[PDB]
């Protein structure tokens, strides 16, 4: 048995790129990506994709209309498929039991029930969404309770490890592929059918197979470790400001230890993105349920450090602006949660902006990729109409500003003409570098007259 | 300025090896290692050194030519261009900061002795692990005791070697770290120390920083390393509650090249002279700098390590029917890591103290640890009523449980068939090191009950 | 159709002695051998002076001993000949190690199980009468299974005890119920039925309850927690009565006439004592933590905390009433046993009140009609005792030259003392602190005599 038609439920940052890459690497597999969101599906069927990922357009364009399809017809795409990926979102619950902590599984469950509603025959159902440990067992129980003659649904776990902004490079050359399934003959056979898909472009030695729960736990563990490295160096950065040390020199010296490695040691105003906080919290919430309070409070520190790193930076801005930013114009340079994406989910720029808005600052926000309307949405819930301007270029944001706040490490911000900017800022003029992108320009900036501050450098 | 005469105060683990390697690599540089203890200096000149692989060869290669070991501290200081400070910096066992803060009295003593014995220009390098900003204290002592023409430059040059691999780590280090003042005088001194290391270390691997970055990098490095162990150990507790295997999880985690695959081996808890001592110093320092969030962040590295030992001990007590009073328990393994006989902060000590408090009879075996050092570490007797020091088979004669606390290879190749028949039943085995992976089926078969970190 | 004809009891204490004595009295055709490692205790059992005081015990022992009742230090031989083996050893709270001050010490239980298996052949029934933590029985099962011998068949039963000290013989001869726990295996029921038939000589079958091992162990812990809680509840009301001018005895009557509440165990006191109530609530508390029920743990913890408050409160009232100082003041303590009709002092409130007053430097003269002097000394020792503690031969010697009379145990004789005689020889002003309400109805006479009388639950 061999997978020949693939259906993917969820046309988001995971569903689209992963399916686009599968189609591009397996010309003989038909890959259909489906979603309830019609405007998102329409945009996938357009010259202007709904997300910005470098090289995604070229991949999509190569296979769309041939063996890659984007549709709102969820039902037909399930009936046709040999393999169904579940790739819907799993946000933190904002309500009820576990509000602010537990994963929200309602989209997952709606998938599982639409799958068993539309399925006949043999299908492999593969949970790619990041879910709590034992969640695949939930899907298995829904299927077993709703069996039909000749219906044989197998459940696999297949966690996704791409990072946004490098999704295509990550999907074409993954560090590893992880697949969990039962230890039964049917489970192993289903695992092997999914292996065969990835083996069109990924070496077998890079494909890890385990059971379902080990698989789900590895995904959470991996994200928490990555988040921990950032929070660890961000904590070091606070120690650096207090002692005269420099966090970049410390990160360099530590990273040269091969047992530690040199990746993910770039101090910042705080990690953003849709999954780091929600996945650590999911891990914390699970610990509570399993009577592991010590494990819960150990990983909670990764989130508390990150919140402290953000609130620290907002206070510096206010405290350096003579402890009042009411009615002062402040340029926010960079709103995406990192560079090379238009995605703002949990971006540190949202939290810095809201802290400054609470003080009555007039924000002018520039980002080269994030859409105008998404910034308004993120800073909503008006305060926005009175205090927030979206700028079309960095110079208009800095025009008449008291302070320039770099929140996203876009390459272009290093190259700006800061003499032009200084000339038209109010005096004294501040730059708060939340990303360490202006290292090496500090002396030049100082001569120009800016008071420049950055994470992990004593003032 | 060219460093041609080197003196090093402290002929300990850090002191001699580093200086022996320097002399071996730098043939025309005079290297004199001096120390308070004469008995130790005589052992450094004797056939038996006070052991690291390859060290005996490097010592005898150049001792007497450009490498000397004298008890004559003051003359070594007097004509040396470079003075290494490599003295022990124990934790304070008293006073403010008790048990956490570093005790700088041996460094202070070195600073005052250096300034008394020095004229002209000398570079003074702190190799010891010190709290950040310690170099400021050394400079203060120097500036307060100035005399004409005296010019002492203070650098930081922390060491990173691991015990057991010192010569490999020193002939081929991942990096050499040198911090000094970001002043013209400071850069003179830094370049002179670099030029030393450049005789065998590529310039690419010689990182230079300001003094405080160099001090902090040493602490922060040990803390990241220990944070990794605590992180996987915390994961190992989850693997037990969820039916995952910490070995498979760790393989999956470690294949992310941004995480790396090193220091992900779950254990009963990290020992060694420095991981706990240096995270604790880091924490103490944060408290003093009014960074409580940072402090409680790094405290979790120790709290998790403490919890991993405590919960291992509870597992033993709870599996043995909730009481180990007057039960014989074998401790196989007392050193903090395999293939050495060093016990500092070893996990066995804590596991053994947890079981002595219950009144269990511990029979301890270790192939490399002296039996006088085990006694000392379980003391301050209650030791004599509960602790007899065994070969491993007699440590397991009539025991209820075998507890493996150090990953000795010899523990894999034992005759657990024989051991099981001469143990009380039910016979238990508690593997705190995952050294019995792959043999579990047999053990269950032998009738043994086996429990390990991160499984079941 | 299997008959128990020889019975061994391991542990000749306040449970083993009485229970087997009534067994021998009510079943003349069964031989009951009581054993213990304590040689002075067993010899006391073989004397005209028994090691404990229970009303009616001397009659029952002497009417059976050397007939079918026996006491011996020969532990091994009693086991080999025995069809039924009781384990009645002590399960004190651990004073060391993990769970110090909370968890039950099982060292003596295990030693019994291992001595039994080393001395057993053929068929025997092993019954756990000691109060053990839930699932303790299972542990005995697994020591028996791991040390099997060619024709062994040790069945394991739970059979908690509900006698109260002071009324043990009445309670053993007319128990409200008998509780037996055993396996649902075929021979599980056969072994339960065997032990039933022993009790059915004198207990009606309707009063014998049969369940499984772990429900029976839990029923015993829960029973003591409910009883202790009634005492703590009325004691807390006693504090409210003092503050509001109500009488706790009147309020207890009003409460207790509700038949859903019942009128037993509503006698307010200085505080509950005895070897089992505190150690068993704590055992329940320690079990909740391990089972991840911190809410249940802190609910039952209140029973203990309220008891400790009642005692502290009582001592503080003595000290406050004596002009806030009792250093060098002679104070009479009447009643040292933990309740009346026993010589037993285990966890007696008299110990705690005495230690509170010794901490103040008071000089105490203690009288108790049954507690032997040596025992009092041990209870107060760890001298401070040589300087501060006198053990009196009669109550008037205790009261001679005293500032205060503190009644801690409800012996009937304290109502009958000659308080006029006592008052003439006390230092003035003279106080009585009635921690048992035994002097109710004497308050007016006592006042006219000139005493300042204070009691629990009255303003
Ligand atoms: N964003 C990232 O970089 C990665 C995220 N993940 C995980 O992958 C999952 C998906 O994440 P994203 O793509 O970022 O989310 P997203 O919100 O961008 O996209 C999920 C899509 O699912 C659709 N959807 C939800 N319920 C549906 C239903 N019942 N039927 C059909 N469509 C439905 C939504 O309309 C949405 O377009 C999450 O579990 C996330 O934690 C894992 C790796 C990478
Ligand atoms: N043990 C390790 O793996 C490493 C330790 N370090 C740091 O290096 C330092 C040295 O540690 P070790 O070499 O293990 O200790 P050690 O105790 O073996 O060596 C210290 C030596 O200095 C001598 N000494 C102490 N005070 C003296 C004084 N006032 N005058 C003259 N000699 C004096 C001692 O007698 C001894 O010979 C510590 O701060 C440690 O944290 C850094 C890297 C690795
Ligand atoms: N005392 C009471 O009012 C009640 C107590 N219980 C429970 O009954 C049990 C016994 O209580 P008590 O009789 O008051 O205690 P106890 O301390 O007066 O009697 C236990 C006896 O067992 C002996 N013993 C200890 N280890 C032994 C061993 N290995 N072999 C033989 N004998 C050994 C002790 O020396 C002692 O004489 C406890 O679990 C208690 O909680 C249950 C109901 C009533
Ligand atoms: O050294 C660093 C690295 C990252 N960040 C920040 O950390 C966040 C996370 O970035 P990154 O991990 O690169 O992007 P994500 O898109 O969130 O990818 C993460 O989250 C995905 C969703 O689960 C995982 O699949 C990926 O492996 C994991 O890298 C961003 O705000 C970054 O700016 C830093 O501040 N310093
Ligand atoms: O995956 C792992 C790796 C190590 N350990 C334990 O962690 C401890 C540390 O081992 P190791 O790092 O080899 O010991 P040290 O000799 O103390 O070396 C550390 O301490 C030195 C003193 O500061 C530093 O120079 C080194 O870089 C640092 O590795 C030992 O008890 C190990 O058993 C684990 O439990 N799991
Ligand atoms: O209304 C009351 C009843 C009792 N007490 C005190 O509470 C303690 C316990 O007394 P009691 O329950 O009569 O005696 P125990 O010997 O502790 O008997 C209890 O503990 C035994 C051991 O578990 C159980 O078998 C019994 O059922 C249970 O009553 C004593 O200090 C009493 O003076 C009061 O203060 N007020």
Swiss-Prot record, chain C:
pH dependence: Optimum pH is 8.6.
Annotated stretches, region: Allosteric switch region: 129-135
InterPro entries given in the database record: 6-PGluconate_DH-like_C_sf, NAD(P)-bd_dom_sf, UDP-Glc/GDP-Man, UDP-Glc/GDP-Man_DH_C, UDP-Glc/GDP-Man_DH_C_sf, UDP-Glc/GDP-Man_DH_dimer, UDP-Glc/GDP-Man_DH_N, UDPglc_DH_euk
UniProt catalytic activity: UDP-alpha-D-glucose + 2 NAD(+) + H2O = UDP-alpha-D-glucuronate + 2 NADH + 3 H(+)
Cross-referenced NCBIfam families: NDP-sugDHase
GO function term, MF aspect, one: NAD binding
Subunit structure: Homohexamer.
Family statement drawn from the similarity comment of this UniProt entry: Belongs to the UDP-glucose/GDP-mannose dehydrogenase family.
PANTHER family in UniProt: UDP-GLUCOSE 6-DEHYDROGENASE (PTHR11374:SF59), UDP-GLUCOSE DEHYDROGENASE/UDP-MANNAC DEHYDROGENASE (PTHR11374)
Effect on the protein of changing residue 276 to A/S: Loss of enzyme activity
Residues bearing the modification N6-acetyllysine: 107
UniProt-annotated catalytic positions: 161 (proton donor/acceptor), 220 (proton donor/acceptor), 276 (nucleophile)
Superkingdom per UniProt: Eukaryota
A GO CC term assigned to this protein in UniProt: extracellular exosome
Residue positions binding NAD(+): 11-16, 36, 41, 89-93, 130-132, 165, 276-279, 346
Role: Catalyzes the formation of UDP-alpha-D-glucuronate, a constituent of complex glycosaminoglycans. Required for the biosynthesis of chondroitin sulfate and heparan sulfate. Required for embryonic development via its role in the biosynthesis of glycosaminoglycans. Required for proper brain and neuronal development.
Residues at which substrate binds: 161-165, 220-224, 260, 267-273, 338-339, 436
Region called Disordered, residue ranges: 88-110
Pathway annotation from the record: Nucleotide-sugar biosynthesis; UDP-alpha-D-glucuronate biosynthesis; UDP-alpha-D-glucuronate from UDP-alpha-D-glucose: step 1/1
Protein name, as recorded: UDP-glucose 6-dehydrogenase
Annotated spans, Important for formation of active hexamer structure: 321-325
Organism per entry: Homo sapiens
Result for mutant: residue 280 to A: Loss of enzyme activity
Domains: entry comment: The protein goes through several conformation states during the reaction cycle, giving rise to hysteresis. In the initial state, the ligand-free protein is in an inactive conformation (E*). Substrate binding triggers a change to the active conformation (E). UDP-xylose binding triggers the transition to a distinct, inhibited conformation. The presence of an intrinsically disordered C-terminus promotes a more dynamic protein structure and favors a conformation with high affinity for UPD-xylose. The allosteric switch region moves by about 5 Angstroms when UDP-xylose is bound, and occupies part of the UDP-glucose binding site. At the same time it promotes domain movements that disrupt the active hexameric ring structure and lead to the formation of a horseshoe-shaped, inactive hexamer.
Modes of activity regulation: UDP-alpha-D-xylose (UDX) acts as a feedback inhibitor. It binds at the same site as the substrate, but functions as allosteric inhibitor by triggering a conformation change that disrupts the active hexameric ring structure and gives rise to an inactive, horseshoe-shaped hexamer.
């Amino acid at each position: 048995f061999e997978i020949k038609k693939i259906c993917c439920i969820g046309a988001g940052y995971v569903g689209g790129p992963t399916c686009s890459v599968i189609a591009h690497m397996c010309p003989e597999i038909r890959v259909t990506v489906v979603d309830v969101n019609e405007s998102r599906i329409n945009a996938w069927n357009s010259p202007t994709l709904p997300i910005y990922e470098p090289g995604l357009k070229e991949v999509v364009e190569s296979c769309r209309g041939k063996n890659l399809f984007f549709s709102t017809n969820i039902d037909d795409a399930i009936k046709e498929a040999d393999l169904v990926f579940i790739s819907v979102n799993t946000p933190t619950k904002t309500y009820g039991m576990g509000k602010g902590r537990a994963a929200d599984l309602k989209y997952i469950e709606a998938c599982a029930r639409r799958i068993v509603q539309n399925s006949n025959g043999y299908k492999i159902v593969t949970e790619k969404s990041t879910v709590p440990v034992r969640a695949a067992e939930s899907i298995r129980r829904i299927f077993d309770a709703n069996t039909k003659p000749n219906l044989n649904l197998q459940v696999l776990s297949n966690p996704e490890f791409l990072a946004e902004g490098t999704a295509i490079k990550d999907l074409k050359n993954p560090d590893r592929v992880l697949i969990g399934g039962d230890e039964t003959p049917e489970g192993q056979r289903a695992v092997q059918a999914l292996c065969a898909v990835y083996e069109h472009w990924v070496p077998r030695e890079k494909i890890l197979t385990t059971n379902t729960w080990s698989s789900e736990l590895s995904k959470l563990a991996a994200n928490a470790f990555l988040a921990q490295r950032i929070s660890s160096i961000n904590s070091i950065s606070a120690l650096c400001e207090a002692t005269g040390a420099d966090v970049e020199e410390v990160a360099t010296a530590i990273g040269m230890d091969q047992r530690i490695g040199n990746k993910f040691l770039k101090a910042s105003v705080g990690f953003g993105g849709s999954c780091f906080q929600k996945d650590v919290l999911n891990l914390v919430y699970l610990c509570e349920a399993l009577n592991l309070p010590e494990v819960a409070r150990y990983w909670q520190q990764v989130i508390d450090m990150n919140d402290y790193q953000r609130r620290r930076f907002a206070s510096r801005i206010i405290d350096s602006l003579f402890n009042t930013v009411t009615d002062k114009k402040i340029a926010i340079l960079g709103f995406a949660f990192k560079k090379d994406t238009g995605d703002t989910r949990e971006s540190s720029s949202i939290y810095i902006s809201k802290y400054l808005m609470d003080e009555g600052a007039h924000l002018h926000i520039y980002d080269p990729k994030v859409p105008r309307e998404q910034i308004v949405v993120d800073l909503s819930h008006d305060q926005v109409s009175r205090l927030v301007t979206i700028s079309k270029d960095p110079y208009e944001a800095c025009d008449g500003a008291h302070a320039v706040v770099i929140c996203t490490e876009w390459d272009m911000f290093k190259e700006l003409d800061y003499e032009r900017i200084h000339k038209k800022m109010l005096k004294p003029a501040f730059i708060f570098d939340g990303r360490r992108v202006l290292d090496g320009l500090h002396n030049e900036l100082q001569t120009i007259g800016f008071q420049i501050e950055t994470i992990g450098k004593k003032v």
